[PDB]
């Protein structure tokens, strides 16, 4: 229940200062716990994942860096107090920590890139999911577009298709369709190297392969190659993730 995940979230707060007291609330946990593997242990998985979702919901970059460290001393304050079980990945929702890590390095990889064309495709992507409070506070926001940034990729693609419907392709319009290719690419380069330090996502990639195919039909030589070394950089991350899921199941 909510009283429990608010008791370990209170023991992690003390797990930054000292441990002794927190190690006795994990010891009271193991004796007072259910201990029936098949779902009560996925009731404390649904707690460790509800606090990783809240350390991700948390100076907008230096503030999102402070949150990849926080979710790093939260993954170290789980390895010790242990926290050596539970896993409710199932369908759509341990791999869930790594995944929320990878998407916080994605949130810092598009925070490091802030220009007027992506900030516009982001404001179109957030006004579509819901309305924004107009008491200033207009990033228009990120702390919740992080726990769910996967969505600001399938929308900063629909804003390259409406910026391509007006592109009139004409050369400066095929330079704006590559600038986005380069960011979704090195945002997928940032999730790969965060796993080395260990059906909408995919559709938006097979959609920009085909739009990176329509453009090289009209493009100065050198440019048509750099967007080809790019769509080769991206296709090689999809085929690597279907290979890793194969090897996962047998």
Curated annotation (Swiss-Prot):
Question: Where found?
Answer: Nucleus, Nuclear pore complex; Chromosome, Centromere, Kinetochore
Tissues showing expression: Widely expressed in fetal and adult tissues. Expressed in the brain and kidney.
Sites where N6-acetyllysine occurs are at: 211
Tell me the superkingdom of the source.
Answer: Eukaryota
Function of the molecule? Involved in poly(A)+ RNA transport. Involved in nephrogenesis.
Family assignment from sequence similarity: Belongs to the nucleoporin Nup133 family.
Pathological condition linked to this protein in its record: Nephrotic syndrome 18: A form of nephrotic syndrome, a renal disease clinically characterized by severe proteinuria, resulting in complications such as hypoalbuminemia, hyperlipidemia and edema. Kidney biopsies show non-specific histologic changes such as focal segmental glomerulosclerosis and diffuse mesangial proliferation. Some affected individuals have an inherited steroid-resistant form that progresses to end-stage renal failure. NPHS18 is an autosomal recessive, steroid-resistant progressive form with onset in the first decade of life.
Quote the subunit structure annotation.
Forms part of the Nup160 subcomplex in the nuclear pore which is composed of NUP160, NUP133, NUP107 and Nup96. This complex plays a role in RNA export and in tethering Nup98 and NUP153 to the nucleus.
List the protein's name.
Nuclear pore complex protein Nup133
**Source organism:** Homo sapiens (Human)
State the encoding gene.
NUP133
Which part of the full protein does this chain span, and how long is the full protein? 518 to 826 of 1156
